[PDB]
Scaffold this active site. Structure first.
Site, PDB file in Angstrom:
ATOM      1  N   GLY A 158       6.256  14.592 -71.640  1.00  0.00           N
ATOM      2  CA  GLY A 158       6.613  15.782 -72.439  1.00  0.00           C
ATOM      3  C   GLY A 158       6.130  15.697 -73.888  1.00  0.00           C
ATOM      4  O   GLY A 158       5.153  14.993 -74.167  1.00  0.00           O
ATOM      5  N   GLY A 161       8.657  16.231 -77.517  1.00  0.00           N
ATOM      6  CA  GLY A 161       9.018  17.622 -77.213  1.00  0.00           C
ATOM      7  C   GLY A 161      10.326  17.973 -77.871  1.00  0.00           C
ATOM      8  O   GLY A 161      11.196  18.593 -77.254  1.00  0.00           O
ATOM      9  N   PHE A 211      13.874  16.446 -79.440  1.00  0.00           N
ATOM     10  CA  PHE A 211      14.805  15.567 -78.676  1.00  0.00           C
ATOM     11  C   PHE A 211      14.401  14.081 -78.742  1.00  0.00           C
ATOM     12  O   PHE A 211      15.267  13.189 -78.738  1.00  0.00           O
ATOM     13  CB  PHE A 211      14.936  16.029 -77.224  1.00  0.00           C
ATOM     14  CG  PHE A 211      15.270  17.498 -77.064  1.00  0.00           C
ATOM     15  CD1 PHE A 211      16.435  18.024 -77.605  1.00  0.00           C
ATOM     16  CD2 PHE A 211      14.432  18.347 -76.336  1.00  0.00           C
ATOM     17  CE1 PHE A 211      16.750  19.373 -77.452  1.00  0.00           C
ATOM     18  CE2 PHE A 211      14.744  19.696 -76.176  1.00  0.00           C
ATOM     19  CZ  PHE A 211      15.905  20.210 -76.735  1.00  0.00           C
ATOM     20  N   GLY A 212      13.089  13.847 -78.689  1.00  0.00           N
ATOM     21  CA  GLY A 212      12.434  12.650 -79.217  1.00  0.00           C
ATOM     22  C   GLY A 212      11.330  12.199 -78.272  1.00  0.00           C
ATOM     23  O   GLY A 212      10.947  12.923 -77.332  1.00  0.00           O
ATOM     24  N   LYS A 213      10.829  10.994 -78.509  1.00  0.00           N
ATOM     25  CA  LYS A 213       9.713  10.457 -77.730  1.00  0.00           C
ATOM     26  C   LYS A 213      10.273   9.863 -76.422  1.00  0.00           C
ATOM     27  O   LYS A 213      11.204   9.048 -76.460  1.00  0.00           O
ATOM     28  CB  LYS A 213       8.929   9.408 -78.553  1.00  0.00           C
ATOM     29  CG  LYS A 213       7.405   9.462 -78.416  1.00  0.00           C
ATOM     30  CD  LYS A 213       6.717  10.413 -79.401  1.00  0.00           C
ATOM     31  CE  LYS A 213       6.926  11.873 -79.015  1.00  0.00           C
ATOM     32  NZ  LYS A 213       6.107  12.854 -79.785  1.00  0.00           N
ATOM     33  N   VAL A 214       9.719  10.295 -75.285  1.00  0.00           N
ATOM     34  CA  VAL A 214      10.037   9.715 -73.968  1.00  0.00           C
ATOM     35  C   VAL A 214       8.799   8.990 -73.429  1.00  0.00           C
ATOM     36  O   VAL A 214       7.763   9.616 -73.199  1.00  0.00           O
ATOM     37  CB  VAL A 214      10.496  10.793 -72.953  1.00  0.00           C
ATOM     38  CG1 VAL A 214      10.959  10.148 -71.645  1.00  0.00           C
ATOM     39  CG2 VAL A 214      11.610  11.640 -73.546  1.00  0.00           C
ATOM     40  N   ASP A 237      25.787  17.913 -71.399  1.00  0.00           N
ATOM     41  CA  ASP A 237      24.552  18.636 -71.719  1.00  0.00           C
ATOM     42  C   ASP A 237      23.736  19.127 -70.512  1.00  0.00           C
ATOM     43  O   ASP A 237      22.537  18.844 -70.391  1.00  0.00           O
ATOM     44  CB  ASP A 237      23.716  17.755 -72.631  1.00  0.00           C
ATOM     45  CG  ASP A 237      22.778  18.547 -73.535  1.00  0.00           C
ATOM     46  OD1 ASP A 237      22.749  19.787 -73.481  1.00  0.00           O
ATOM     47  OD2 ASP A 237      22.059  17.912 -74.325  1.00  0.00           O
TER      48      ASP A 237
HETATM   49  C1  LIG Z   1      14.629   7.633 -70.601  1.00  0.00           C
HETATM   50  O1  LIG Z   1      15.571   8.516 -71.239  1.00  0.00           O
HETATM   51  C2  LIG Z   1      15.529   9.831 -70.900  1.00  0.00           C
HETATM   52  C3  LIG Z   1      14.517  10.400 -70.143  1.00  0.00           C
HETATM   53  C4  LIG Z   1      14.575  11.733 -69.798  1.00  0.00           C
HETATM   54  N1  LIG Z   1      13.553  12.279 -69.005  1.00  0.00           N
HETATM   55  C5  LIG Z   1      12.939  11.791 -67.822  1.00  0.00           C
HETATM   56  C6  LIG Z   1      13.666  10.913 -66.982  1.00  0.00           C
HETATM   57  C7  LIG Z   1      15.005  10.489 -67.282  1.00  0.00           C
HETATM   58  N2  LIG Z   1      16.096  10.186 -67.475  1.00  0.00           N
HETATM   59  C8  LIG Z   1      13.099  10.470 -65.767  1.00  0.00           C
HETATM   60  N3  LIG Z   1      11.904  10.851 -65.372  1.00  0.00           N
HETATM   61  C9  LIG Z   1      11.198  11.722 -66.175  1.00  0.00           C
HETATM   62  C10 LIG Z   1       9.931  12.128 -65.720  1.00  0.00           C
HETATM   63  C11 LIG Z   1       9.184  13.020 -66.440  1.00  0.00           C
HETATM   64  O2  LIG Z   1       7.965  13.524 -66.063  1.00  0.00           O
HETATM   65  C12 LIG Z   1       7.161  12.863 -65.062  1.00  0.00           C
HETATM   66  C13 LIG Z   1       6.338  13.923 -64.374  1.00  0.00           C
HETATM   67  C14 LIG Z   1       5.327  14.574 -65.263  1.00  0.00           C
HETATM   68  N4  LIG Z   1       4.697  15.817 -64.779  1.00  0.00           N
HETATM   69  C15 LIG Z   1       4.513  15.814 -63.320  1.00  0.00           C
HETATM   70  C16 LIG Z   1       3.822  17.083 -62.857  1.00  0.00           C
HETATM   71  N5  LIG Z   1       2.526  17.242 -63.516  1.00  0.00           N
HETATM   72  C17 LIG Z   1       1.847  18.459 -63.061  1.00  0.00           C
HETATM   73  C18 LIG Z   1       2.727  17.261 -64.962  1.00  0.00           C
HETATM   74  C19 LIG Z   1       3.392  15.992 -65.427  1.00  0.00           C
HETATM   75  C20 LIG Z   1       9.657  13.509 -67.675  1.00  0.00           C
HETATM   76  O3  LIG Z   1       8.808  14.371 -68.312  1.00  0.00           O
HETATM   77  C21 LIG Z   1       9.216  14.901 -69.594  1.00  0.00           C
HETATM   78  C22 LIG Z   1      10.882  13.099 -68.153  1.00  0.00           C
HETATM   79  C23 LIG Z   1      11.683  12.217 -67.412  1.00  0.00           C
HETATM   80  C24 LIG Z   1      15.639  12.511 -70.254  1.00  0.00           C
HETATM   81 CL1  LIG Z   1      15.735  14.183 -69.809  1.00  0.00          CL
HETATM   82  C25 LIG Z   1      16.649  11.971 -71.014  1.00  0.00           C
HETATM   83  C26 LIG Z   1      16.584  10.631 -71.334  1.00  0.00           C
HETATM   84 CL2  LIG Z   1      17.843   9.922 -72.287  1.00  0.00          CL
END
Ligand SMILES: COc1cc(Nc2c(C#N)cnc3cc(OCCCN4CCN(C)CC4)c(OC)cc23)c(Cl)cc1Cl
Ligand SMILES: [Cl-]
Length: 280
Positions: free
Chosen positions: A20, A22, A24-27, A131
Protein backbone atom coordinates in the site's frame (compact mmCIF):
# COMPACT_ATOMS: atom_id res chain seq x y z
CA UNK A 1 2.41 -15.07 22.16
CA UNK A 2 4.16 -11.86 23.38
CA UNK A 3 7.08 -9.48 22.66
CA UNK A 4 10.74 -10.53 22.42
CA UNK A 5 13.21 -7.90 23.72
CA UNK A 6 16.21 -10.34 23.61
CA UNK A 7 16.08 -10.90 19.80
CA UNK A 8 17.03 -8.78 16.78
CA UNK A 9 14.24 -9.12 14.14
CA UNK A 10 16.71 -8.90 11.21
CA UNK A 11 18.00 -12.38 12.21
CA UNK A 12 14.52 -13.87 11.55
CA UNK A 13 13.03 -11.55 8.89
CA UNK A 14 14.16 -10.00 5.58
CA UNK A 15 12.37 -6.92 4.19
CA UNK A 16 11.44 -7.45 0.53
CA UNK A 17 9.12 -4.47 -0.14
CA UNK A 18 6.32 -2.16 0.90
CA UNK A 19 2.56 -2.77 0.82
CA UNK A 20 0.00 0.00 0.00
CA UNK A 21 1.05 3.66 0.64
CA UNK A 22 -0.90 4.98 2.52
CA UNK A 23 -1.06 7.20 5.57
CA UNK A 24 -1.68 5.10 8.79
CA UNK A 25 1.99 4.38 8.15
CA UNK A 26 4.53 2.19 6.37
CA UNK A 27 3.56 -1.52 5.99
CA UNK A 28 6.45 -3.81 4.93
CA UNK A 29 6.34 -7.15 3.14
CA UNK A 30 8.74 -9.49 5.02
CA UNK A 31 10.06 -13.04 4.33
CA UNK A 32 11.17 -15.47 7.02
CA UNK A 33 14.86 -16.39 6.48
CA UNK A 34 14.44 -19.93 7.87
CA UNK A 35 11.02 -20.93 6.48
CA UNK A 36 10.22 -18.60 3.59
CA UNK A 37 6.88 -17.69 5.23
CA UNK A 38 5.58 -14.26 4.23
CA UNK A 39 4.49 -11.51 6.70
CA UNK A 40 3.10 -8.00 6.71
CA UNK A 41 5.29 -5.96 9.09
CA UNK A 42 4.69 -2.63 10.79
CA UNK A 43 7.78 -1.10 12.42
CA UNK A 44 6.81 1.55 15.01
CA UNK A 45 9.43 3.82 16.71
CA UNK A 46 7.62 2.01 27.83
CA UNK A 47 4.93 4.77 27.88
CA UNK A 48 4.60 4.54 24.03
CA UNK A 49 4.90 0.71 24.23
CA UNK A 50 2.25 -0.65 26.65
CA UNK A 51 -0.23 1.08 24.27
CA UNK A 52 0.40 -1.75 21.78
CA UNK A 53 0.77 -4.67 24.28
CA UNK A 54 -3.01 -5.16 24.57
CA UNK A 55 -3.33 -5.50 20.74
CA UNK A 56 -0.38 -7.98 20.54
CA UNK A 57 -1.77 -10.09 23.43
CA UNK A 58 -5.09 -10.18 21.50
CA UNK A 59 -3.57 -11.21 18.19
CA UNK A 60 -1.49 -13.86 20.02
CA UNK A 61 -4.39 -15.41 22.00
CA UNK A 62 -6.94 -15.39 19.13
CA UNK A 63 -7.07 -18.78 17.42
CA UNK A 64 -9.76 -18.17 14.78
CA UNK A 65 -9.61 -18.64 10.99
CA UNK A 66 -11.10 -15.18 10.21
CA UNK A 67 -8.66 -13.22 12.41
CA UNK A 68 -5.04 -12.47 11.33
CA UNK A 69 -2.27 -14.42 13.10
CA UNK A 70 0.67 -12.90 14.88
CA UNK A 71 3.89 -14.46 13.48
CA UNK A 72 6.20 -12.42 15.77
CA UNK A 73 6.52 -9.31 17.94
CA UNK A 74 9.98 -7.84 18.68
CA UNK A 75 11.41 -4.83 20.60
CA UNK A 76 14.88 -3.93 19.26
CA UNK A 77 16.67 -0.56 19.33
CA UNK A 78 13.84 2.06 19.60
CA UNK A 79 11.37 0.23 17.33
CA UNK A 80 8.49 -2.22 17.93
CA UNK A 81 8.10 -4.81 15.13
CA UNK A 82 4.77 -6.58 14.60
CA UNK A 83 4.85 -9.45 12.08
CA UNK A 84 1.45 -10.58 10.86
CA UNK A 85 0.36 -13.43 8.58
CA UNK A 86 0.61 -12.11 4.99
CA UNK A 87 -2.85 -11.95 3.34
CA UNK A 88 -2.14 -12.13 -0.39
CA UNK A 89 -5.53 -10.84 -1.49
CA UNK A 90 -4.87 -7.54 0.36
CA UNK A 91 -7.60 -5.27 1.77
CA UNK A 92 -11.15 -5.10 0.49
CA UNK A 93 -10.99 -1.32 0.01
CA UNK A 94 -7.87 -1.69 -2.19
CA UNK A 95 -9.69 -4.28 -4.32
CA UNK A 96 -12.65 -1.98 -4.90
CA UNK A 97 -10.15 0.68 -5.99
CA UNK A 98 -8.28 -1.65 -8.44
CA UNK A 99 -11.54 -2.70 -10.15
CA UNK A 100 -13.21 0.74 -9.72
CA UNK A 101 -16.34 -0.90 -8.34
CA UNK A 102 -18.15 -2.00 -5.21
CA UNK A 103 -18.79 -5.59 -4.26
CA UNK A 104 -21.90 -7.45 -5.36
CA UNK A 105 -24.49 -8.49 -2.80
CA UNK A 106 -23.38 -12.17 -2.88
CA UNK A 107 -19.78 -11.07 -2.20
CA UNK A 108 -20.94 -8.73 0.55
CA UNK A 109 -22.93 -11.63 2.08
CA UNK A 110 -19.75 -13.74 2.44
CA UNK A 111 -17.72 -10.94 3.98
CA UNK A 112 -20.59 -10.14 6.34
CA UNK A 113 -21.03 -13.76 7.40
CA UNK A 114 -17.34 -14.19 8.06
CA UNK A 115 -17.02 -10.81 9.86
CA UNK A 116 -19.97 -11.75 12.12
CA UNK A 117 -18.37 -15.09 13.03
CA UNK A 118 -15.12 -13.36 13.84
CA UNK A 119 -16.87 -10.69 15.97
CA UNK A 120 -18.98 -13.32 17.75
CA UNK A 121 -15.68 -15.00 18.62
CA UNK A 122 -14.01 -11.77 19.72
CA UNK A 123 -17.02 -10.51 21.69
CA UNK A 124 -17.44 -13.85 23.54
CA UNK A 125 -13.85 -13.23 24.80
CA UNK A 126 -14.73 -9.56 25.67
CA UNK A 127 -12.42 -8.29 22.91
CA UNK A 128 -13.66 -5.25 21.02
CA UNK A 129 -12.01 -4.73 17.60
CA UNK A 130 -12.52 -0.93 17.65
CA UNK A 131 -11.56 -0.16 14.02
CA UNK A 132 -13.74 -2.12 11.58
CA UNK A 133 -13.64 -0.87 7.98
CA UNK A 134 -12.94 -2.34 4.54
CA UNK A 135 -9.28 -1.39 4.93
CA UNK A 136 -8.97 -3.77 7.91
CA UNK A 137 -10.75 -6.69 6.22
CA UNK A 138 -8.00 -8.55 4.37
CA UNK A 139 -8.32 -11.50 2.02
CA UNK A 140 -6.71 -14.88 1.32
CA UNK A 141 -6.49 -16.50 -2.13
CA UNK A 142 -8.97 -19.13 -0.90
CA UNK A 143 -11.66 -16.44 -0.60
CA UNK A 144 -11.72 -16.02 3.18
CA UNK A 145 -11.36 -12.78 5.15
CA UNK A 146 -9.01 -11.93 7.95
CA UNK A 147 -9.96 -9.21 10.41
CA UNK A 148 -6.83 -7.11 10.94
CA UNK A 149 -5.35 -4.13 12.80
CA UNK A 150 -7.49 -3.93 15.97
CA UNK A 151 -6.84 -0.21 16.37
CA UNK A 152 -3.04 -0.24 15.86
CA UNK A 153 -2.82 1.86 12.66
CA UNK A 154 -4.81 4.76 14.16
CA UNK A 155 -2.81 4.72 17.45
CA UNK A 156 0.36 4.91 15.29
CA UNK A 157 -1.14 7.67 13.08
CA UNK A 158 -1.63 9.60 16.38
CA UNK A 159 2.20 10.28 16.37
CA UNK A 160 -8.38 13.83 7.41
CA UNK A 161 -6.80 10.37 7.02
CA UNK A 162 -8.03 8.46 10.07
CA UNK A 163 -11.37 10.27 10.09
CA UNK A 164 -13.74 7.88 11.97
CA UNK A 165 -16.45 7.46 9.43
CA UNK A 166 -17.20 3.98 10.83
CA UNK A 167 -17.59 5.04 14.49
CA UNK A 168 -20.79 4.40 16.44
CA UNK A 169 -22.77 7.52 17.35
CA UNK A 170 -22.64 6.86 21.10
CA UNK A 171 -18.83 7.04 21.08
CA UNK A 172 -18.05 9.44 18.24
CA UNK A 173 -16.81 12.20 20.65
CA UNK A 174 -14.78 9.92 22.89
CA UNK A 175 -11.02 9.48 23.05
CA UNK A 176 -11.49 6.61 25.50
CA UNK A 177 -14.77 4.77 26.09
CA UNK A 178 -16.39 3.70 29.37
CA UNK A 179 -16.67 0.08 30.32
CA UNK A 180 -20.39 -0.60 29.87
CA UNK A 181 -22.41 -3.75 29.09
CA UNK A 182 -23.06 -2.62 25.46
CA UNK A 183 -19.56 -1.39 24.61
CA UNK A 184 -18.93 -4.28 22.19
CA UNK A 185 -22.03 -3.15 20.24
CA UNK A 186 -19.89 -0.30 18.85
CA UNK A 187 -18.32 -2.95 16.53
CA UNK A 188 -21.73 -3.93 15.18
CA UNK A 189 -22.50 -0.36 14.03
CA UNK A 190 -19.05 -0.26 12.35
CA UNK A 191 -19.88 -3.58 10.65
CA UNK A 192 -22.97 -1.94 9.23
CA UNK A 193 -20.99 1.05 7.91
CA UNK A 194 -18.41 -1.34 6.42
CA UNK A 195 -21.21 -3.06 4.52
CA UNK A 196 -22.36 0.26 3.03
CA UNK A 197 -18.72 1.03 2.20
CA UNK A 198 -18.41 -2.32 0.37
CA UNK A 199 -21.64 -1.62 -1.50
CA UNK A 200 -20.73 1.99 -2.52
CA UNK A 201 -16.91 2.14 -2.37
CA UNK A 202 -16.93 4.95 0.25
CA UNK A 203 -18.55 5.15 3.68
CA UNK A 204 -21.36 7.62 4.40
CA UNK A 205 -20.25 11.26 4.82
CA UNK A 206 -16.92 10.56 3.04
CA UNK A 207 -16.98 14.05 1.48
CA UNK A 208 -16.93 15.87 4.86
CA UNK A 209 -14.01 17.13 6.96
CA UNK A 210 -13.18 15.09 10.18
CA UNK A 211 -14.80 17.42 12.70
CA UNK A 212 -17.94 17.76 10.66
CA UNK A 213 -18.19 13.95 10.33
CA UNK A 214 -18.32 13.41 14.15
CA UNK A 215 -21.27 15.77 14.42
CA UNK A 216 -22.93 14.39 11.37
CA UNK A 217 -22.77 10.82 12.78
CA UNK A 218 -24.08 11.95 16.20
CA UNK A 219 -27.01 13.88 14.72
CA UNK A 220 -28.16 12.07 11.58
CA UNK A 221 -30.62 9.28 11.17
CA UNK A 222 -28.79 6.00 10.50
CA UNK A 223 -27.39 5.88 6.94
CA UNK A 224 -29.20 3.76 4.31
CA UNK A 225 -28.13 2.47 0.91
CA UNK A 226 -27.99 5.20 -1.73
CA UNK A 227 -29.83 3.17 -4.40
CA UNK A 228 -32.21 0.69 -2.65
CA UNK A 229 -33.39 -0.84 -5.99
CA UNK A 230 -29.96 -2.49 -6.50
CA UNK A 231 -30.20 -4.39 -3.23
CA UNK A 232 -32.40 -7.06 -1.73
CA UNK A 233 -34.90 -6.46 1.06
CA UNK A 234 -32.74 -8.71 3.25
CA UNK A 235 -29.66 -6.50 2.81
CA UNK A 236 -31.64 -3.33 3.60
CA UNK A 237 -33.35 -4.91 6.58
CA UNK A 238 -30.03 -6.21 7.89
CA UNK A 239 -28.54 -2.70 7.72
CA UNK A 240 -31.63 -1.18 9.32
CA UNK A 241 -31.35 -3.41 12.38
CA UNK A 242 -27.55 -3.28 12.67
CA UNK A 243 -27.43 0.52 12.31
CA UNK A 244 -29.50 1.23 15.40
CA UNK A 245 -28.33 4.38 17.17
CA UNK A 246 -29.21 2.86 20.57
CA UNK A 247 -26.43 0.45 21.54
CA UNK A 248 -28.66 -1.53 23.97
CA UNK A 249 -31.19 -2.56 21.33
CA UNK A 250 -28.58 -2.90 18.53
CA UNK A 251 -28.21 -6.66 17.92
CA UNK A 252 -25.20 -8.79 18.82
CA UNK A 253 -23.15 -10.61 16.19
CA UNK A 254 -24.84 -13.91 17.29
CA UNK A 255 -28.28 -12.40 16.69
CA UNK A 256 -27.26 -11.08 13.25
CA UNK A 257 -25.99 -14.53 12.23
CA UNK A 258 -29.65 -15.67 12.48
CA UNK A 259 -30.73 -12.99 9.98
CA UNK A 260 -31.74 -14.15 6.41
CA UNK A 261 -29.08 -11.98 4.76
CA UNK A 262 -26.39 -14.31 6.11
CA UNK A 263 -27.95 -17.33 7.92
CA UNK A 264 -27.86 -19.56 4.79
CA UNK A 265 -24.34 -18.51 3.66
CA UNK A 266 -22.09 -21.63 3.69
CA UNK A 267 -19.74 -21.12 0.68
CA UNK A 268 -17.07 -18.49 0.07
CA UNK A 269 -17.35 -18.96 -3.71
CA UNK A 270 -18.39 -15.40 -4.48
CA UNK A 271 -15.33 -14.09 -2.59
CA UNK A 272 -12.99 -16.52 -4.33
CA UNK A 273 -14.33 -15.35 -7.70
CA UNK A 274 -13.68 -11.74 -6.59
CA UNK A 275 -10.03 -12.33 -5.60
CA UNK A 276 -9.39 -14.39 -8.78
CA UNK A 277 -10.39 -11.38 -10.89
CA UNK A 278 -8.11 -8.91 -9.00
CA UNK A 279 -5.08 -11.25 -9.40
CA UNK A 280 -5.70 -11.34 -13.19
C1 LIG B 1 1.63 -5.66 9.97
O1 LIG B 1 0.70 -4.74 10.56
C2 LIG B 1 -0.43 -4.44 9.87
C3 LIG B 1 -0.64 -4.82 8.55
C4 LIG B 1 -1.84 -4.53 7.93
N1 LIG B 1 -2.04 -4.95 6.60
C5 LIG B 1 -1.78 -6.19 5.98
C6 LIG B 1 -1.78 -7.37 6.76
C7 LIG B 1 -2.01 -7.35 8.18
N2 LIG B 1 -2.26 -7.37 9.30
C8 LIG B 1 -1.59 -8.63 6.15
N3 LIG B 1 -1.43 -8.76 4.85
C9 LIG B 1 -1.46 -7.62 4.07
C10 LIG B 1 -1.30 -7.78 2.69
C11 LIG B 1 -1.35 -6.71 1.84
O2 LIG B 1 -1.27 -6.76 0.48
C12 LIG B 1 -0.71 -7.92 -0.19
C13 LIG B 1 -1.38 -8.02 -1.54
C14 LIG B 1 -1.05 -6.89 -2.46
N4 LIG B 1 -1.88 -6.73 -3.67
C15 LIG B 1 -2.32 -8.03 -4.21
C16 LIG B 1 -3.13 -7.84 -5.48
N5 LIG B 1 -2.35 -7.12 -6.49
C17 LIG B 1 -3.13 -6.95 -7.73
C18 LIG B 1 -1.94 -5.83 -5.95
C19 LIG B 1 -1.11 -6.02 -4.70
C20 LIG B 1 -1.52 -5.41 2.36
O3 LIG B 1 -1.53 -4.41 1.42
C21 LIG B 1 -1.68 -3.05 1.88
C22 LIG B 1 -1.64 -5.22 3.72
C23 LIG B 1 -1.63 -6.31 4.60
C24 LIG B 1 -2.82 -3.82 8.63
CL1 LIG B 1 -4.33 -3.47 7.86
C25 LIG B 1 -2.63 -3.43 9.93
C26 LIG B 1 -1.43 -3.74 10.54
CL2 LIG B 1 -1.16 -3.27 12.18
CL1 LIG C 1 -24.30 17.76 11.14
Amino acid sequence: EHVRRDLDPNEVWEIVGELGDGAFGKVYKAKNKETGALAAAKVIEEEELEDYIVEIEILATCDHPYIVKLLGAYYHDGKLWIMIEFCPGGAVDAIMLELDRGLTEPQIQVVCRQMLEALNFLHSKRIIHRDLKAGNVLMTLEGDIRLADFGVSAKNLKTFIGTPYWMAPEVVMCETMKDTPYDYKADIWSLGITLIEMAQIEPPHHELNPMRVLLKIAKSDPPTLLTPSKWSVEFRDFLKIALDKNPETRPSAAQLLEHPFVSSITSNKALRELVAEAKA
